[PDB]
Amino acid sequence: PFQSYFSGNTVQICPVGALTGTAYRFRARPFDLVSSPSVCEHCASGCAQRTDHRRGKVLRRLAGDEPEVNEEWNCDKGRWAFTYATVGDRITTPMLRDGGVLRPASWSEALTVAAAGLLTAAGSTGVLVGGRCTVEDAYAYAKFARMVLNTNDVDFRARPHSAEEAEFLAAHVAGQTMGLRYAELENAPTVLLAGFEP
Amino acid sequence: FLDALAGFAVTLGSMFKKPITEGYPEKPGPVAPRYHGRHQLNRYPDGLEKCIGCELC
Numbered sequence: 001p002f003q004s005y006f007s008g009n010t011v012q013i014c015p016v017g018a019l020t021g022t023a024y025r026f027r028a029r030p031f032d033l034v035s036s037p038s039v040c041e042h043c044a045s046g047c048a049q050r051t052d053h054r055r056g057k058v059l060r061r062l063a064g065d066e067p068e069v070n071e072e073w074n075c076d077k078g079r080w081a082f083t084y085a086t087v088g089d090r091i092t093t094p095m096l097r098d099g100g101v102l103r104p105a106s107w108s109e110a111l112t113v114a115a116a117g118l119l120t121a122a123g124s125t126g127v128l129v130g131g132r133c134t135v136e137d138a139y140a141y142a143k144f145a146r147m148v149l150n151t152n153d154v155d156f157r158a159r160p161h162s163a164e165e166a167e168f169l170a171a172h173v174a175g176q177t178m179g180l181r182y183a184e185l186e187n188a189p190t191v192l193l194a195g196f197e198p
Numbered sequence: 199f200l201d202a203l204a205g206f207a208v209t210l211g212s213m214f215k216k217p218i219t220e221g222y223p224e225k226p227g228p229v230a231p232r233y234h235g236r237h238q239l240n241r242y243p244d245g246l247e248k249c250i251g252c253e254l255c
């Protein structure tokens with residue numbers, strides 16, 4: 001097989017209907033697509049993309065055009081890994097633990113129970129934020145943990161990690177943006193990859 | 199002078215001419231052959247649907 005992580009680009013680069021995505025096949029024509037600019041959720045590359053959806057279902061995600069980030073390219077993950085939210089496992093309503101079973105609950109009841117439990121847990125609470133949250137979402141998690149739960153036990157690292165990693169991120173990463181850019185990678189005479197598989 | 203009464207001669211006359219109303223619904227009137235009635239999806243003589251789902255319509 002073709003077998004490359006960038007195969008979808010060949011679909012987007014073909015000036016005719018020769019190469020086509022089997023996922024998008026016969027599912028829509030341009031006029032009925034709702035198309036919106038987007039950013040890929042998966043990697044830290046932050047590719048600009050164009051999400052196309054019909055009748056409320058995302059059909060494809062084209063590479064967009066961000067010369068400073070990804071130019072006109074994606075990996076297959078960003079192009080096609082958008083069906084996760086519609087595989088049937090999505091939680092559609094707030095849930096509560098009643099009788100040991102997870103039962104659908106109203107927003108009011110769920111919020112009330114969660115607030116009661118958190119207050120009963122006062123300072124003895126941890127906040128695992130995960131790496132999927134947006135900058136705003138992660139900020140909300142941190143602000144909730146420190147202002148509401150009055151705890152510093154906040155960590156987005158849902159993966160192998162170390163305290164040395166936290167110290168390094170604070171020292172050299174946090175609060176320092178645009179120190180290196182894609183445009184600089186293309187021009188760097190030497191690039192040393194440590195613990196990184198690009 | 200009778201010209202001002204011409205309208206009377208009209209209506210009375212029409213009172214003796216056959217009404218021109220179409221007999222719908224019992225006897226529906228003839229629509230134009232080209233009339234834009236309900237859309238219809240057609241088949242080939244062997245029964246296959248003609249619609250290829252091109253969405254051009």
Ligand code: SF4
Pocket residue numbers: 015016017018
């Ligand atoms: S068949 Fe498809 S690729 Fe060929 S001209 Fe028509 S739209 Fe373009």
Ligand code: SF4
Pocket residue numbers: 040041042043044045046047070073074075076077078079
């Ligand atoms: S498109 Fe591929 S490389 Fe770009 S952010 Fe998504 S997963 Fe990462």
Ligand code: SF4
Pocket residue numbers: 248249250251252253254255
């Ligand atoms: S325009 Fe295309 S999709 Fe619409 S009825 Fe005709 S063949 Fe079918």
